[PDB]
Design a protein around this nucleic acid. Structure first.
Ligand SMILES: [Mg+2]
Ligand SMILES: [Mg+2]
Ligand SMILES: [Mg+2]
Ligand SMILES: [Mg+2]
Ligand SMILES: [Mg+2]
Ligand SMILES: [Mg+2]
Ligand SMILES: [Mg+2]
Ligand SMILES: [Mg+2]
Ligand SMILES: [Mg+2]
Ligand SMILES: [Mg+2]
Ligand SMILES: [Mg+2]
Ligand SMILES: [Mg+2]
Ligand SMILES: [Mg+2]
Ligand SMILES: [Mg+2]
Ligand SMILES: [Mg+2]
Ligand SMILES: [Mg+2]
Ligand SMILES: [Mg+2]
Ligand SMILES: [Mg+2]
Ligand SMILES: [Mg+2]
Ligand SMILES: [Mg+2]
Ligand SMILES: [Mg+2]
Ligand SMILES: [Mg+2]
Ligand SMILES: [Mg+2]
Ligand SMILES: [Mg+2]
Ligand SMILES: [Mg+2]
Ligand SMILES: [Mg+2]
Ligand SMILES: [Mg+2]
Ligand SMILES: [Mg+2]
Ligand SMILES: [Mg+2]
Ligand SMILES: [Mg+2]
Ligand SMILES: [Mg+2]
Ligand SMILES: [Mg+2]
Ligand SMILES: [Mg+2]
Ligand SMILES: [Mg+2]
Ligand SMILES: [Mg+2]
Ligand SMILES: [Mg+2]
Ligand SMILES: [Mg+2]
Ligand SMILES: [Mg+2]
Ligand SMILES: [Mg+2]
Ligand SMILES: [Mg+2]
Ligand SMILES: [Mg+2]
Ligand SMILES: [Mg+2]
Ligand SMILES: [Mg+2]
Ligand SMILES: [Mg+2]
Ligand SMILES: [Mg+2]
Ligand SMILES: [Mg+2]
Ligand SMILES: [Mg+2]
Ligand SMILES: [Mg+2]
Ligand SMILES: [Mg+2]
Ligand SMILES: [Mg+2]
Ligand SMILES: [Mg+2]
Ligand SMILES: [Mg+2]
Ligand SMILES: [Mg+2]
Ligand SMILES: [Mg+2]
Ligand SMILES: [Mg+2]
Ligand SMILES: [Mg+2]
Ligand SMILES: [Mg+2]
Ligand SMILES: [Mg+2]
Ligand SMILES: [Mg+2]
Ligand SMILES: [Mg+2]
Ligand SMILES: [Mg+2]
Ligand SMILES: [Mg+2]
Ligand SMILES: [Mg+2]
Ligand SMILES: [Mg+2]
Ligand SMILES: [Mg+2]
Ligand SMILES: [Mg+2]
Ligand SMILES: [Mg+2]
Ligand SMILES: [Mg+2]
Ligand SMILES: [Mg+2]
Ligand SMILES: [Mg+2]
Ligand SMILES: [Mg+2]
Ligand SMILES: [Mg+2]
Ligand SMILES: [Mg+2]
Ligand SMILES: [Mg+2]
Ligand SMILES: [Mg+2]
Ligand SMILES: [Mg+2]
Ligand SMILES: [Mg+2]
Ligand SMILES: [Mg+2]
Ligand SMILES: [Mg+2]
Ligand SMILES: [Mg+2]
Ligand SMILES: [Mg+2]
Ligand SMILES: [Mg+2]
Ligand SMILES: [Mg+2]
Ligand SMILES: [Mg+2]
Ligand SMILES: [Mg+2]
Ligand SMILES: [Mg+2]
Ligand SMILES: [Mg+2]
Ligand SMILES: [Mg+2]
Ligand SMILES: [Mg+2]
Ligand SMILES: [Mg+2]
Ligand SMILES: [Mg+2]
Ligand SMILES: [Mg+2]
Ligand SMILES: [Mg+2]
Ligand SMILES: [Mg+2]
Ligand SMILES: [Mg+2]
Ligand SMILES: [Mg+2]
Ligand SMILES: [Mg+2]
Ligand SMILES: [Mg+2]
Ligand SMILES: [Mg+2]
Ligand SMILES: [Mg+2]
Ligand SMILES: [Mg+2]
Ligand SMILES: [Mg+2]
Ligand SMILES: [Mg+2]
Ligand SMILES: [Mg+2]
Ligand SMILES: [Mg+2]
Ligand SMILES: [Mg+2]
Ligand SMILES: [Mg+2]
Ligand SMILES: [Mg+2]
Ligand SMILES: [Mg+2]
Ligand SMILES: [Mg+2]
Ligand SMILES: [Mg+2]
Ligand SMILES: [Mg+2]
Ligand SMILES: [Mg+2]
Ligand SMILES: [Mg+2]
Ligand SMILES: [Mg+2]
Ligand SMILES: [Mg+2]
Ligand SMILES: [Mg+2]
Ligand SMILES: [Mg+2]
Ligand SMILES: [Mg+2]
Ligand SMILES: [Mg+2]
Ligand SMILES: [Mg+2]
Ligand SMILES: [Mg+2]
Ligand SMILES: [Mg+2]
Ligand SMILES: [Mg+2]
Ligand SMILES: [Mg+2]
Ligand SMILES: [Mg+2]
Ligand SMILES: [Mg+2]
Ligand SMILES: [Mg+2]
Ligand SMILES: [Mg+2]
Ligand SMILES: [Mg+2]
Ligand SMILES: [Mg+2]
Ligand SMILES: [Mg+2]
Ligand SMILES: [Mg+2]
Ligand SMILES: [Mg+2]
Ligand SMILES: [Mg+2]
Ligand SMILES: [Mg+2]
Ligand SMILES: [Mg+2]
Ligand SMILES: [Mg+2]
Ligand SMILES: [Mg+2]
Ligand SMILES: [Mg+2]
Ligand SMILES: [Mg+2]
Ligand SMILES: [Mg+2]
Ligand SMILES: [Mg+2]
Ligand SMILES: [Mg+2]
Ligand SMILES: [Mg+2]
Ligand SMILES: [Mg+2]
Ligand SMILES: [Mg+2]
Ligand SMILES: [Mg+2]
Ligand SMILES: [Mg+2]
Ligand SMILES: [Mg+2]
Ligand SMILES: [Mg+2]
Ligand SMILES: [Mg+2]
Ligand SMILES: [Mg+2]
Ligand SMILES: [Mg+2]
Ligand SMILES: [Mg+2]
Ligand SMILES: [Mg+2]
Ligand SMILES: [Mg+2]
Ligand SMILES: [Mg+2]
Ligand SMILES: [Mg+2]
Ligand SMILES: [Mg+2]
Ligand SMILES: [Mg+2]
Ligand SMILES: [Mg+2]
Ligand SMILES: [Mg+2]
Ligand SMILES: [Mg+2]
Ligand SMILES: [Mg+2]
Ligand SMILES: [Mg+2]
Ligand SMILES: [Mg+2]
Ligand SMILES: [Mg+2]
Ligand SMILES: [Mg+2]
Ligand SMILES: [Mg+2]
Ligand SMILES: [Mg+2]
Ligand SMILES: [Mg+2]
Ligand SMILES: [Mg+2]
Ligand SMILES: [Mg+2]
Ligand SMILES: [Mg+2]
Ligand SMILES: [Mg+2]
Ligand SMILES: [Mg+2]
Ligand SMILES: [Mg+2]
Ligand SMILES: [Mg+2]
Ligand SMILES: [Mg+2]
Ligand SMILES: [Mg+2]
Ligand SMILES: [Mg+2]
Ligand SMILES: [Mg+2]
Ligand SMILES: [Mg+2]
Ligand SMILES: [Mg+2]
Ligand SMILES: [Mg+2]
Ligand SMILES: [Mg+2]
Ligand SMILES: [Mg+2]
Ligand SMILES: [Mg+2]
Ligand SMILES: [Mg+2]
Ligand SMILES: [Mg+2]
Ligand SMILES: [Mg+2]
Ligand SMILES: [Mg+2]
Ligand SMILES: [Mg+2]
Ligand SMILES: [Mg+2]
Ligand SMILES: [Mg+2]
Ligand SMILES: [Mg+2]
Ligand SMILES: [Mg+2]
Ligand SMILES: [Mg+2]
Ligand SMILES: [Mg+2]
Ligand SMILES: [Mg+2]
Ligand SMILES: [Mg+2]
Ligand SMILES: [Mg+2]
Ligand SMILES: [Mg+2]
Ligand SMILES: [Mg+2]
Ligand SMILES: [Mg+2]
Ligand SMILES: [Mg+2]
Ligand SMILES: [Mg+2]
Ligand SMILES: [Mg+2]
Ligand SMILES: [Mg+2]
Ligand SMILES: [Mg+2]
Ligand SMILES: [Mg+2]
Ligand SMILES: [Mg+2]
Ligand SMILES: [Mg+2]
Ligand SMILES: [Mg+2]
Ligand SMILES: [Mg+2]
Ligand SMILES: [Mg+2]
Ligand SMILES: [Mg+2]
Ligand SMILES: [Mg+2]
Ligand SMILES: [Mg+2]
Ligand SMILES: [Mg+2]
Ligand SMILES: [Mg+2]
Ligand SMILES: [Mg+2]
Ligand SMILES: [Mg+2]
Ligand SMILES: [Mg+2]
Ligand SMILES: [Mg+2]
Ligand SMILES: [Mg+2]
Ligand SMILES: [Mg+2]
Ligand SMILES: [Mg+2]
Ligand SMILES: [Mg+2]
Ligand SMILES: [Mg+2]
Ligand SMILES: [Mg+2]
Ligand SMILES: [Mg+2]
Ligand SMILES: [Mg+2]
Ligand SMILES: [Mg+2]
Ligand SMILES: [Mg+2]
Ligand SMILES: [Mg+2]
Ligand SMILES: [Mg+2]
Ligand SMILES: [Mg+2]
Ligand SMILES: [Mg+2]
Ligand SMILES: [Mg+2]
Ligand SMILES: [Mg+2]
Ligand SMILES: [Mg+2]
Ligand SMILES: [Mg+2]
Ligand SMILES: [Mg+2]
Ligand SMILES: [Mg+2]
Ligand SMILES: [Mg+2]
Ligand SMILES: [Mg+2]
Ligand SMILES: [Mg+2]
Ligand SMILES: [Mg+2]
Ligand SMILES: [Mg+2]
Ligand SMILES: [Mg+2]
Ligand SMILES: [Mg+2]
Ligand SMILES: [Mg+2]
Ligand SMILES: [Mg+2]
Ligand SMILES: [Mg+2]
Ligand SMILES: [Mg+2]
Ligand SMILES: [Mg+2]
Ligand SMILES: [Mg+2]
Lengths: 272, 49
RNA sequence: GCCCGGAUAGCUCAGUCGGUAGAGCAGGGGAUUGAAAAUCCCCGUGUCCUUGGUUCGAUUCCGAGUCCGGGCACCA
RNA sequence: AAUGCGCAGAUACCGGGAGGAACGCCGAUGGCGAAGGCAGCCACCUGGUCCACCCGUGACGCUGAGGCGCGAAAGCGUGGGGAG
RNA sequence: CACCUCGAUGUCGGCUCGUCGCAUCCUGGGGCUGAAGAAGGUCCCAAGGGUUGGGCUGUUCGCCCAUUAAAGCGGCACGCG
RNA sequence: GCGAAUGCCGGCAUGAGUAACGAUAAAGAGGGUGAGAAUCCCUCUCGCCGUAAGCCCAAGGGUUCCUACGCAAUGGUCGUCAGCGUAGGGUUAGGCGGGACCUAAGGUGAAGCCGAAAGGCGUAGCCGAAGGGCAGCCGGUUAAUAUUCCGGCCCUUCCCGCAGGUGCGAUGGGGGGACGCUCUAGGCUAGGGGGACCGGAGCCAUGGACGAGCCCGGCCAGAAGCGCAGGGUGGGAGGUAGGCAAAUCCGCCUCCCAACAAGCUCUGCGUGGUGGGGAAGCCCGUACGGGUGACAACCCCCCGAAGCCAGGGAGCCAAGAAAAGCCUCUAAGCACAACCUGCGGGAACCCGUACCGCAAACCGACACAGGUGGGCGGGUGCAAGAGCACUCAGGCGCGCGGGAGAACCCUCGCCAAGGAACUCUGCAAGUUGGCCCCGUAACUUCGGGAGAAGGGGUGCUCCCUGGGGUGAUGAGCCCCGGGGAGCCGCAGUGAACAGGCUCUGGCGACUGUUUACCAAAAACACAGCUCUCUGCGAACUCGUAAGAGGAGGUAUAGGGAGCGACGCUUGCCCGGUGCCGGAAGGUCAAGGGGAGGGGUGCAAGCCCCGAACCGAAGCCCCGGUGAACGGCGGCCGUAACUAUAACGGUCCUAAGGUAGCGAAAUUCCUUGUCGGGUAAGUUCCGACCUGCACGAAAAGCGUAACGACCGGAGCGCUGUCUCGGCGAGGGACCCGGUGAAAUUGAACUGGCCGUGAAGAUGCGGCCUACCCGUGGCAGGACGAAAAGACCCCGUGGAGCUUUACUGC
RNA sequence: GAGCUAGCCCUGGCCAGGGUGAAGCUGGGGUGAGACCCAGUGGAGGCCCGAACCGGUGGGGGAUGCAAACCCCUCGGAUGA
RNA sequence: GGUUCGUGGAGCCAUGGGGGAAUCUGGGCGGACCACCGCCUAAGGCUAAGUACUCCGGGUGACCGAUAGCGCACCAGUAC
């Protein structure tokens, strides 16, 4: 769903907050498997390298398991589904028979008391992770490794998911959240299911304040500065771009593709 | 009015300190000159505890 | 006020190193129709804005003008 | 006829893959539904309806302002989807 | 036109304070008249003193409202920071 | 060899005994001292702070503390005084705060990576604090220090030792430490208010009172043991394939008891052996404390924290430090070691510790009406309150005074009649203003608009009455009320704090942000919509690089861009520019290639140019694309009254402005033309539209609610005005004290008409005019101030743009 | 040179007292079951009034100032960007 | 890049990139190049003196003489 508020205050009128019904008897995270302290800072060593970042609530990083493969065969119980401010998705805390505890980016449908596990052995069912080469072509699947033993990196941002299209030897054709059709290695792990909290995309912040709580600082429009600052700057009473829409730096920001062509990564992709 | 000089002994020794000057080839040349010039004090005199 | 451009058949326009100037429509005579249109078939027509000049000869090249359209009229 | 598509190689043919939508033949003036409607196949959930036996209740019936629900198509919202 | 002033002569309008000119709006005289009378028109003397308050606009001006004997024009660095 | 450079340095003048003398909280007198005191001391009157103008802490400052001598100078006057000179004293911890602890950002940095050098990064570690950790409170003394010295009571560490317990044992595993916002429960405490109760020196004044009168005070700390609040916490036994060794520890499973507890614990609060404080007043008394008041009393009620038990509880989303100490686990090691628990005796370093500290001792050149973080901050009354009035404790009257009683200025008070006629504008000032009760419209996104508007009550006295919390179910004490009679003034939130209100437009949705030092806004931002780039060693940004941010993120996500709540919408043109897609073509650089030619050698040779042709990206070319840069017509003629023109013609293009708006934040002509408000309206509102030159995400048109935004009405009220008057205080003025400034060729510096480089005190003629000041006014000295900020000129300079040029 | 000013990062502190009364609950009503509608409890909010604190709207004063941006009255925000 | 040498006919000496020998009948140079004729020996290193400067000590001066001379003749790079 998603809670809505009555206009008892402007901006309270359009604000909607996600609903944490599937948030299990948790709330505070388990200091152990996470949380690590999380270094906040909107720039590199010295200068800011990404504008409009800063402020925004204190956060505790939740060190999550992006390669469930360590525990091949070892099953584990979905002990809880906690809130995790470092991501849009919700995370599932799971106790292994091993006695080991770790967090997996909670998949959709995943539920308390449920038992999950990873490996070739694993039964194709929401939660289980295995190499792509075993996941029945066609099934949907999230958290996917791009290259073997390199850690899951595709689909995991709430309501995200990729789908097996078929295979070409060691590779399987996947359709990532982008609509891109790329070949990915078969040994690359992927946990079956579809992230979850697919409603995330429907939260309406409601007021500038909310962007601030998210560490998102006011963003200034280019044409609205002076030429010393931006390609769109100055002129007088408002003004259209007056040149191909650009970025503070000069590159056209409407159409101009940035992907470098000669990258080896291609030859593994097929349109987006 | 809140002015430009807000004294802070830590901030001084830290900013114009001796160990401060000594760390940067830039600060090392300051001491170098002040010495040649005869300056009685090579660093901003400041005391704490 | 200063500068540029346009002034060709009744209307709307095309065209020409200079020399017997065209288009569409309109208009005129026929034909088809019971009769109007549409549609066939035949037709003129233009002192090529005015005025000076150059030339053998200019609507076609040059100067002045008349009316029309466009631009400028700022620091004061 | 022209647009338009085609030697930077279309059309036509073969093989492979994607996707969406509608479901040939059976389908008939046929059937079900209160109406709108409902058509490839399968499973589950579920309404309605006919018949036989004539066993039980015993008239508990009919209709029905208002209310309530349903209600083709187009159209609107949020998101998705998109071949024709 | 550009002669003083660009090592500075503050540059509209309003307010305040005025003062002067007359080519007089009023009031005072006077000749005419297509001046019966009262009203005027017109021109000649004549500023001594008067020369209203509002609506609109920054306005000067101007147009209106309501009056008035009249509701003058102009100069004083478009008098006066 | 100097008169000039708004010359430089120094000196001394002018303005001038002039403006000032730094908050309008205020003074007066009597005694002292003294060469000399308005200005120092003391006393007594008076006024002023008191959520302070009073206290304590941190920073900063550094002797400014105290004391004795002192006054040149410094203290805007005076000074016998000083925060000033000379000198002398004074700041004393195991427990307070730093350090012989810990980690945060961030620094630094073994490995290691990178840079022409300097040097730049950087897993550990180290450094790093007002965060975590960590043992003391109450009194007493000094002129000046005190949680540091002293007294009482109470603690912490380490080393050695005796006794008794135990597998002891890490920088390693685990646990813990450990954590948000808002709202809050139960007990306490700090703090405060009563007392018919207890302990007090005294007092009865001026008409009354010797009264269960007035005035003063009725506390503090405190180990154990106890109580009373709470906070923490399951206990067993089995398995174990996880916590990068091991584990008897955690973590997982399994079963056995317990289970909104108890027990064990740990805080806090009381009580506590006991220790200590102990007014008013009165007497000494310089001062400025001491005595006495006492063998002081030290008790009962009530209000009660934003503090404590505290890691308590609930709810919420934005989902809220690390590390050590501390427990527990075991590895090496060692188990005559070693820990632990008792109890003794020893040992216990360094630095700060004075003083000012919202300020005369800090930041502002000044003893500057400014700035400066934390805690305490009493009482009464007003609904509350850290507000407002007065006032405790405490501290002040601000370091020039005395008189006057003008103009004019400042801040202030009142005003006849009228009332916005004032003005750009009701600018300013008024009106209104608290709480309780009636009662409130359009429109609306249903919240709102609401404190709409508009009214009524509000003081005090007496009677009756309803509830609560604390005592126990009564008493007193407090906390909310209801009703019934009556009194007094002009007036009852009787003073102080405490909205003027409507109707209607523009812009922006809204709370927010901005030009520190002339703009707070219609600007920026903002939720939200769209476009576009980005598959992750992402794109993009910083860096020469390494590295890093993005992100320990991964398309429901990141970057860029534009619009800008929300509603209804967002037309048509890709012909030029841009971006996207085109394995063909044309062109195209090194390069490959050598047809061919040349220079020299006697020659082999050696060196040279060099046509085909094969040679990328880019461009040309073909396509696409508008919430990509952008663009979106002209002239004629037509309807049977006229007029217009649904319709037509024909040029023009890439296509020819759709909806919706429209004399508009856009309209020139224009106070356009009709309506409306007005006695009158260049403004304003409604209209109509030849829209000089609106128009759909540089969004279009709307829109509830917001606006210290901007415009137009009206009501209320008024000195804004007609139209001024009076009055107050601070100045102005006079007297005593101290005493500037910009300016200044030098002066013995009148008016008019003239003249003059064309506006003369300084020339001509004429007219005026005894010498010198004081308070005022501002016409002139083209008055002061800034080598004009406009203009133009410098083949002057900078910032910005682009399809200027050349480059990186 | 960021001991002024701008932004961020780490760790702490502060915000009198009033008002409005969201969701949730709980009870009642409603229905086949519901939505929903009443009470009450509840305590939300870039919510409201208003100190501190943070501002700096309008006017006046100041203009060799108390001050190289101050003072007075008046306004803005005040659990939040 | 250096040389006077700014492509210039541009050599010589340096060197970042690619290719890549030889040992004396080897190899570099005499300003493209070739041929004669000549000079010289690369791809390792060291080496007094003549030369530069003056913080410091001294001598001198048609050098200054306290606004001059060093910024300081004076407890000056201090006060500020
Ligand atoms: Mg809002
Ligand atoms: Mg939590
Ligand atoms: Mg960095
Ligand atoms: Mg760093
Ligand atoms: Mg740095
Ligand atoms: Mg940068
Ligand atoms: Mg996380
Ligand atoms: Mg995630
Ligand atoms: Mg997120
Ligand atoms: Mg399969
Ligand atoms: Mg923006
Ligand atoms: Mg701007
Ligand atoms: Mg630019
Ligand atoms: Mg800049
Ligand atoms: Mg630019
Ligand atoms: Mg721009
Ligand atoms: Mg621009
Ligand atoms: Mg500008
Ligand atoms: Mg414009
Ligand atoms: Mg443009
Ligand atoms: Mg780029
Ligand atoms: Mg790859
Ligand atoms: Mg796509
Ligand atoms: Mg793409
Ligand atoms: Mg500061
Ligand atoms: Mg410090
Ligand atoms: Mg500091
Ligand atoms: Mg010395
Ligand atoms: Mg030093
Ligand atoms: Mg010191
Ligand atoms: Mg013609
Ligand atoms: Mg023509
Ligand atoms: Mg033509
Ligand atoms: Mg015809
Ligand atoms: Mg002609
Ligand atoms: Mg100008
Ligand atoms: Mg100009
Ligand atoms: Mg096929
Ligand atoms: Mg068929
Ligand atoms: Mg039926
Ligand atoms: Mg089937
Ligand atoms: Mg039968
Ligand atoms: Mg029967
Ligand atoms: Mg329907
Ligand atoms: Mg439909
Ligand atoms: Mg001059
Ligand atoms: Mg001038
Ligand atoms: Mg001058
Ligand atoms: Mg002038
Ligand atoms: Mg006006
Ligand atoms: Mg006019
Ligand atoms: Mg004139
Ligand atoms: Mg004038
Ligand atoms: Mg003036
Ligand atoms: Mg003026
Ligand atoms: Mg001279
Ligand atoms: Mg001179
Ligand atoms: Mg001068
Ligand atoms: Mg004098
Ligand atoms: Mg005097
Ligand atoms: Mg004078
Ligand atoms: Mg003064
Ligand atoms: Mg003073
Ligand atoms: Mg004596
Ligand atoms: Mg004496
Ligand atoms: Mg008080
Ligand atoms: Mg107060
Ligand atoms: Mg000191
Ligand atoms: Mg002293
Ligand atoms: Mg002292
Ligand atoms: Mg002392
Ligand atoms: Mg002496
Ligand atoms: Mg003395
Ligand atoms: Mg003295
Ligand atoms: Mg003295
Ligand atoms: Mg002396
Ligand atoms: Mg003094
Ligand atoms: Mg002084
Ligand atoms: Mg004396
Ligand atoms: Mg003293
Ligand atoms: Mg001690
Ligand atoms: Mg002690
Ligand atoms: Mg001690
Ligand atoms: Mg030590
Ligand atoms: Mg030691
Ligand atoms: Mg440390
Ligand atoms: Mg450390
Ligand atoms: Mg530290
Ligand atoms: Mg510390
Ligand atoms: Mg803490
Ligand atoms: Mg601490
Ligand atoms: Mg301590
Ligand atoms: Mg203690
Ligand atoms: Mg004591
Ligand atoms: Mg004493
Ligand atoms: Mg002492
Ligand atoms: Mg003490
Ligand atoms: Mg004490
Ligand atoms: Mg002592
Ligand atoms: Mg022993
Ligand atoms: Mg023993
Ligand atoms: Mg033990
Ligand atoms: Mg043993
Ligand atoms: Mg052990
Ligand atoms: Mg240990
Ligand atoms: Mg240990
Ligand atoms: Mg651990
Ligand atoms: Mg709280
Ligand atoms: Mg106590
Ligand atoms: Mg008490
Ligand atoms: Mg009380
Ligand atoms: Mg007695
Ligand atoms: Mg008596
Ligand atoms: Mg008496
Ligand atoms: Mg008596
Ligand atoms: Mg009596
Ligand atoms: Mg009594
Ligand atoms: Mg192990
Ligand atoms: Mg079990
Ligand atoms: Mg006593
Ligand atoms: Mg006694
Ligand atoms: Mg006694
Ligand atoms: Mg804790
Ligand atoms: Mg620890
Ligand atoms: Mg061993
Ligand atoms: Mg050992
Ligand atoms: Mg132990
Ligand atoms: Mg013992
Ligand atoms: Mg010891
Ligand atoms: Mg030591
Ligand atoms: Mg002390
Ligand atoms: Mg002390
Ligand atoms: Mg001391
Ligand atoms: Mg002190
Ligand atoms: Mg003081
Ligand atoms: Mg103090
Ligand atoms: Mg203050
Ligand atoms: Mg103060
Ligand atoms: Mg304070
Ligand atoms: Mg101050
Ligand atoms: Mg003073
Ligand atoms: Mg009282
Ligand atoms: Mg009262
Ligand atoms: Mg009150
Ligand atoms: Mg009150
Ligand atoms: Mg008072
Ligand atoms: Mg007088
Ligand atoms: Mg005053
Ligand atoms: Mg009056
Ligand atoms: Mg009135
Ligand atoms: Mg009235
Ligand atoms: Mg009031
Ligand atoms: Mg009133
Ligand atoms: Mg109304
Ligand atoms: Mg309204
Ligand atoms: Mg209203
Ligand atoms: Mg009374
Ligand atoms: Mg009465
Ligand atoms: Mg009052
Ligand atoms: Mg009242
Ligand atoms: Mg109010
Ligand atoms: Mg706004
Ligand atoms: Mg907005
Ligand atoms: Mg605002
Ligand atoms: Mg400003
Ligand atoms: Mg504002
Ligand atoms: Mg702005
Ligand atoms: Mg914006
Ligand atoms: Mg939108
Ligand atoms: Mg929108
Ligand atoms: Mg950097
Ligand atoms: Mg990261
Ligand atoms: Mg905008
Ligand atoms: Mg709407
Ligand atoms: Mg186009
Ligand atoms: Mg196109
Ligand atoms: Mg195009
Ligand atoms: Mg195209
Ligand atoms: Mg191509
Ligand atoms: Mg050849
Ligand atoms: Mg040839
Ligand atoms: Mg040849
Ligand atoms: Mg030869
Ligand atoms: Mg031979
Ligand atoms: Mg060739
Ligand atoms: Mg090419
Ligand atoms: Mg467009
Ligand atoms: Mg568009
Ligand atoms: Mg585009
Ligand atoms: Mg027409
Ligand atoms: Mg059009
Ligand atoms: Mg409109
Ligand atoms: Mg119009
Ligand atoms: Mg108009
Ligand atoms: Mg008019
Ligand atoms: Mg009408
Ligand atoms: Mg009108
Ligand atoms: Mg238009
Ligand atoms: Mg458009
Ligand atoms: Mg647009
Ligand atoms: Mg509009
Ligand atoms: Mg609106
Ligand atoms: Mg505002
Ligand atoms: Mg505003
Ligand atoms: Mg008045
Ligand atoms: Mg007056
Ligand atoms: Mg008077
Ligand atoms: Mg007076
Ligand atoms: Mg003259
Ligand atoms: Mg003379
Ligand atoms: Mg003369
Ligand atoms: Mg006067
Ligand atoms: Mg004057
Ligand atoms: Mg000049
Ligand atoms: Mg300027
Ligand atoms: Mg030139
Ligand atoms: Mg030039
Ligand atoms: Mg530029
Ligand atoms: Mg800073
Ligand atoms: Mg700073
Ligand atoms: Mg209730
Ligand atoms: Mg608020
Ligand atoms: Mg102000
Ligand atoms: Mg202001
Ligand atoms: Mg003035
Ligand atoms: Mg003054
Ligand atoms: Mg407020
Ligand atoms: Mg050249
Ligand atoms: Mg040459
Ligand atoms: Mg050459
Ligand atoms: Mg050369
Ligand atoms: Mg060369
Ligand atoms: Mg050679
Ligand atoms: Mg080389
Ligand atoms: Mg080389
Ligand atoms: Mg080779
Ligand atoms: Mg040889
Ligand atoms: Mg040989
Ligand atoms: Mg030989
Ligand atoms: Mg040989
Ligand atoms: Mg040879
Ligand atoms: Mg060579
Ligand atoms: Mg050679
Ligand atoms: Mg040679
Ligand atoms: Mg040669
Ligand atoms: Mg040679
Ligand atoms: Mg050799
Ligand atoms: Mg030496
Ligand atoms: Mg020597
Ligand atoms: Mg010497
Ligand atoms: Mg001499
Ligand atoms: Mg001298
Ligand atoms: Mg000298
Ligand atoms: Mg001298
Ligand atoms: Mg010397
Ligand atoms: Mg000197
Ligand atoms: Mg000497
Ligand atoms: Mg000497
Ligand atoms: Mg000295």
């Amino acid at each position: 769903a998603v809670k809505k508020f009555k206009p008892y205050t402007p901006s309270r009128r359009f604000m909607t907050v996600a609903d944490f019904s599937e948030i299990t008897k948790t709330e505070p995270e388990k200091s152990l498997v996470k949380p690590l302290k999380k270094t906040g800072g909107r720039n590199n060593q010295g200068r800011i390298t990404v504008r409009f970042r800063g402020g925004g609530h204190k956060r505790l990083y939740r060190i999550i398991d992006f390669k469930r493969w360590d525990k091949v065969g070892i099953p584990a119980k979905v002990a809880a589904i906690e809130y995790d401010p470092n991501r849009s998705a919700r995370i599932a805390l799971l106790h292994y028979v091993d006695g080991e505890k770790r967090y997996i980016i909670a998949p959709d449908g995943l539920q308390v008391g449920q038992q999950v596990v990873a490996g070739p052995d694993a039964p194709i069912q929401v939660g289980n992770a295995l190499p792509l080469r075993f996941i029945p072509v066609g099934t949907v699947v999230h958290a996917v490794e791009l290259e073997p033993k390199k850690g899951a990196k595709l689909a995991r941002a709430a309501g995200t998911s990729a789908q097996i299209q078929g295979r070409e030897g060691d590779y399987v054709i996947l359709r990532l959240p982008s609509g891109e059709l790329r070949k990915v290695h078969g040994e690359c792990y992927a946990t079956v299911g579809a992230v979850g909290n697919a409603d995330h995309k429907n939260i309406v912040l409601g007021k500038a304040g909310r962007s601030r709580w998210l560490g998102r600082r006011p963003h200034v429009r280019g044409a609205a500065m002076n030429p010393v600052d931006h390609p769109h700057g100055g002129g007088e009473g408002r003004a259209p771009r007056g040149r191909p829409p650009a970025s503070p730096w000069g590159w056209q920001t409407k159409g101009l593709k940035t992907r470098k062509r000669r990258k080896p990564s291609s030859r593994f992709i097929i349109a987006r | 009015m809140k002015r430009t000089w807000q004294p802070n002994r830590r901030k001084r020794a830290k900013t114009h300190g001796f160990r401060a000057r000594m760390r940067t080839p830039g600060g090392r040349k300051v001491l170098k000159r002040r010495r040649q010039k005869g300056r009685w004090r090579l660093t901003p005199a400041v005391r704490k505890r």
